[PDB]
């Protein structure tokens with residue numbers, strides 16, 4: 020091999036080994052191999068990387084180089100031809116609420132983040148990439164094709180910087196290049212608490228022995244808290260409304276404010292921790308602050324794993340669920356819990372589930388005000404519509420009463436994301452998420468569609484006729500091959516998402532396999548999985564089975580009408596009940612007695 024002991028982790032940590040609590044970084048989960056699943060380590064490779072020069076140069080970089088004999092097509096062209104559509108009508112998912120899309124994003128943020136590069140405390144190429152579209156070093160621009168309207172209006176490209184990678188931060192030369200996962204691989208609410216000790220400690224309220232998370236001191240939502248403001252300037256959230264001067268929120272994860280509905284769920288989660296910590300202080304007046312924090316935290320981790328595995332996964336994977344995720348049989352220390360590189364692209368099926376608008380509803384679940392429904396592109400990095408325009412309740416009702424967008428082979432990704440995305444570093448609402456997904460697959464050394472079809476034990480299309488049969492669509496198959504010139508070159512993201520959906524699910528066979536095996540691994544390779552004997556007591560697990568997202572809303576908002584099954588499509592008011600009908604989480608089992 021090339022080094023088995025390489026890298027730039029968090030330095031000096033040692034395992035307690037008989038401690039009830041997860042570490043913040045994820046170290047010490049696996050006794051035998053402590054760094055497994057820890058944050059700031061390389062994403063795992065389930066298959067060897069594919070680079071133009073075998074090591075680090077992505078396909079698409081050199082113009083004369085081919086992949087299997089052909090030029091790879093430009094990400095934006097694939098975007099323009101396959102991914103865009105104009106008419107938003109009829110695209111809604113008739114049996115999935117907007118919360119279905121939004122939870123996907125929460126789970127994702129808990130599992131994987133692959134940061135971009137700097138080594139530019141002040142850079143000037145950071146401007147050579149934007150201003151001039153010059154490829155080079157970590158600038159890998161998305162060039163516009165001939166006849167792209169953004170040419171007329173935007174320039175020659177969209178800037179794009181390669182993903183950070185292990186060992187160093189420098190150009191290098193050891194093993195093939197591996198990207199970093201800056202968060203913990205375990206579903207452990209790292210998105211609320213942080214994945215590094217410094218951020219984790221900054222998010223806490225250490226001014227009092229109550230094990231609380233710090234809340235914003237400038238704004239309140241009917242007596243309920245908001246996260247802290249991230250008071251580092253310049254702020255993306257301030258930039259979108261020079262006048263409101265409302266900054267981004269501070270959470271355990273830096274993307275928290277990417278969009279308003281994401282900021283919203285982060286807020287409920289923060290609020291739930293504090294609720295939990297208060298409740299455990301009435302029950303155990305003798306507990307110190309550290310114990311309150313850790314105990315509340317452990318519960319919150321179990322809520323996220325439960326909602327995810329009991330309510331969310333079954334409706335993404337449908338009939339494939341049991342094929343890839345059998346009933347839990349206990350912790351297996353031989354299982355690799357790392358998130359794989361390919362999963363961070365497979366989990367992006369979610370991009371096709373985002374609708375063009377977001378609504379605010381009032382207490383009768385009717386349009387809230389004259390500007391109730393808003394285009395998604397104005398909600399990127401937008402915290403001012405929250406703080407200054409209703410708080411989170413009207414947003415929360417929207418999440419329950421509105422639908423997600425349905426993946427559709429003819430209508431993939433809304434123009435709100437495909438033409439009008441806002442990137443926190445630049446200043447235009449003019450980027451293309453789809454094109455970015457394609458560029459990123461290449462950046463990350465992904466194998467092609469057929470390599471993954473094979474990995475998953477599925478047939479590999481060698482012909483147009485074969486691709487037609489697999490996609491079950493003549494027209495999609497043909498545009499795809501007019502661009503790629505062989506199924507082997509199709510980027511995993513577009514190939515995976517082009518497959519028709521398995522029965523009672525929302526992803527096709529390939530994605531169901533990639534998703535499925537990954538989820539099986541993080542549950543079975545987790546020493547702190549909630550069902551593993553010894554983590555919780557039996558009585559404690561009997562209480563946890565009764566959690567729901569609907570209850571989380573009742574305890575942390577002023578929404579008083581919710582559905583019993585929040586992920587499916589719900590109509591008001593037939594499918595909405597009063598909060599009193601929804602099970603509460605009983606904490607008596609956490610009552611500790613002295614003698």
Ligand code: HEM
Pocket residue numbers: 120121122123124127131132133134277278362363364366367368369370372373452455456459
């Ligand atoms: C704005 C964005 C969203 C909502 C309006 C959104 C939504 C989702 C859903 C619902 C996901 C899963 C079900 C999901 C997964 C992942 N995303 Fe995506 N997303 C928005 C915007 C972005 C941006 C920008 C990125 C970074 C793109 C890049 O490559 O530079 C992004 C990424 C991801 C991602 C990979 C994360 C990682 O491992 O680094 C998902 C698993 N999303 N999003």
Ligand SMILES: *[C@@H]1O[C@H](CO)[C@@H](O[C@@H]2O[C@H](CO)[C@@H](O[C@H]3O[C@H](CO)[C@@H](O)[C@H](O)[C@@H]3O)[C@H](O)[C@H]2NC(C)=O)[C@H](O)[C@H]1NC(C)=O
Pocket residue numbers: 114334523584587588
């Ligand atoms: C909207 O989606 C719903 C969930 O995807 C779906 O109903 C679900 O159907 C599944 C089986 O396909 C059932 O799962 C479990 O529920 C029963 C309760 O009667 C249990 O006893 C069984 O163990 C069973 O496995 C549920 O009945 C149901 N899921 C939930 C949690 O509600 C609807 O059919 C969809 N609506 C439409 C119009 O298709």
Ligand SMILES: *[C@@H]1O[C@H](CO)[C@@H](O[C@@H]2O[C@H](CO)[C@@H](O[C@H]3O[C@H](CO)[C@@H](O)[C@H](O)[C@@H]3O)[C@H](O)[C@H]2NC(C)=O)[C@H](O)[C@H]1NC(C)=O
Pocket residue numbers: 224226227231232233234235236
């Ligand atoms: C860390 O936790 C501290 C303890 O809860 C907390 O202090 C509490 O702060 C709130 C307001 O910030 C106070 O609530 C009071 O608000 C009005 C002022 O307009 C008063 O008139 C009322 O008495 C009301 O109680 C709490 O009194 C205060 N509690 C204590 C015991 O000091 C901090 O705010 C938390 N720090 C962070 C950064 O979140």
Ligand SMILES: *[C@@H]1O[C@H](CO)[C@@H](O[C@@H]2O[C@H](CO)[C@@H](O[C@H]3O[C@H](CO)[C@@H](O)[C@H](O)[C@@H]3O)[C@H](O)[C@H]2NC(C)=O)[C@H](O)[C@H]1NC(C)=O
Pocket residue numbers: 259260262263403407
């Ligand atoms: C930047 O954010 C501003 C809010 O912080 C926002 O201005 C605010 O929004 C509207 C104006 O469009 C006003 O709402 C209503 O207020 C009173 C009564 O409540 C009405 O009489 C007004 O007619 C209006 O409908 C807010 O008062 C207003 N606040 C201020 C101080 O202007 C801007 O719209 C945001 N700008 C952009 C470009 O996003």
Ligand SMILES: *[C@@H]1O[C@H](CO)[C@@H](O[C@@H]2O[C@H](CO)[C@@H](O)[C@H](O)[C@H]2NC(C)=O)[C@H](O)[C@H]1NC(C)=O
Pocket residue numbers: 351352353354
């Ligand atoms: C823990 O999971 C591991 C790894 O998947 C299992 O160990 C073996 O895995 C290989 C690879 O598929 C296969 O040979 C078998 O599935 C397993 N070996 C045999 C012959 O037992 C293992 O089943 C799990 N450990 C426990 C105790 O369940």
Ligand SMILES: [C-]#N
Pocket residue numbers: 124274277
């Ligand atoms: C999406 N992040």
Ligand SMILES: [Ca+2]
Pocket residue numbers: 129130202203204205206207208209210
């Ligand atoms: Ca995590």
